[PDB]
């Protein structure tokens, strides 16, 4: 790996610089290098890994959706034949996106998840596994699509089980996991009722626990609760 000669601490330092410069591909490459040093990641380091890849894959997903919409329009009645270029370029972006997802899933499998014993790390990594299988599902059309969807589901479900046993209902990781698994139900698994029920129950159980929190923890939890409410408003 091209980061093999750089110190772990230097990679983390540069990831933070790359974030300030909005250089998210660099940030992700630095964090990949840091993971590949083989040591477990701290809370802050897990967040840097997450932010870097979220921004890279989020840009790819946005571009894929633009291209897929153009491709869909090209296939409607009365549309002039424009050649293979739209499909080719959508496939190019799709393949790069799949490559990023495969890289993240590879880091999680070698060996972040198996060494993650505390709920805050294990839930975080299993949520990420669900998320990156969800991004693969968004673009999947082949024989393995059901298995990709089920891989996302399985990862989310393991994270949910741990989070409900080991974290308070206001924990931001627990909340963000529920938010994203609810989106999985709505957008991937054709299960809008499950999506709505999960978001509502998560929101209500968090509300009931806010009284236990400091002002700063309250801010953290209510920020994610508002996202749950935003989705419920969208869906009802």
């Amino acid at each position: 790996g091209a980061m093999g000669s750089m110190e772990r601490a230097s990679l983390i330092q540069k990831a933070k610089l790359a974030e300030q410069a909005e250089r998210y591909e660099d940030m992700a490459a630095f964090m990949k290098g840091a993971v590949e040093k083989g040591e477990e990641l701290s809370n802050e380091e897990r967040n840097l890994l997450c932010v870097a890849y979220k921004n890279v894959v989020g840009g790819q997903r946005a571009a894929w959706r633009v291209l897929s919409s153009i491709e869909q329009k090209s296939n409607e009645e009365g549309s002039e034949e424009k050649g293979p270029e739209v499909r080719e370029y959508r496939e190019k972006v799709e393949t790069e996106l799949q490559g990023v997802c495969d890289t993240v899933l590879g880091l999680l499998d070698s060996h972040l998840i198996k060494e993650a014993g505390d709920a805050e790390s294990r839930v975080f990594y299993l949520k990420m596994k669900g998320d990156y299988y969800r991004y693969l599902a968004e673009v999947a059309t082949g024989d393995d699509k059901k298995r990709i969807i089920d891989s996302a589901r399985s990862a989310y479900q393991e994270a949910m089980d741990i989070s409900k046993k080991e974290m308070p209902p206001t924990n931001p990781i627990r909340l963000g996991l529920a938010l994203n698994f609810s989106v999985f139900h709505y957008e991937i698994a054709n299960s809008p009722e499950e999506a709505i029920s999960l978001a509502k129950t998560t929101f209500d159980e968090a509300m009931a626990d806010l009284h236990t929190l400091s002002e700063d923890s309250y801010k953290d939890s209510t920020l994610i609760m508002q996202l749950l409410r935003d989705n419920l408003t969208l869906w009802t």
């Binding site: 938010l179 994203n180 989106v183 709505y186 957008e187 996202l227």
Partner: peptide, 5 residues
């Protein structure tokens, strides 16, 4: 699109 984090 719905919100995710």
């Amino acid at each position: 699109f719905p919100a995710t984090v």
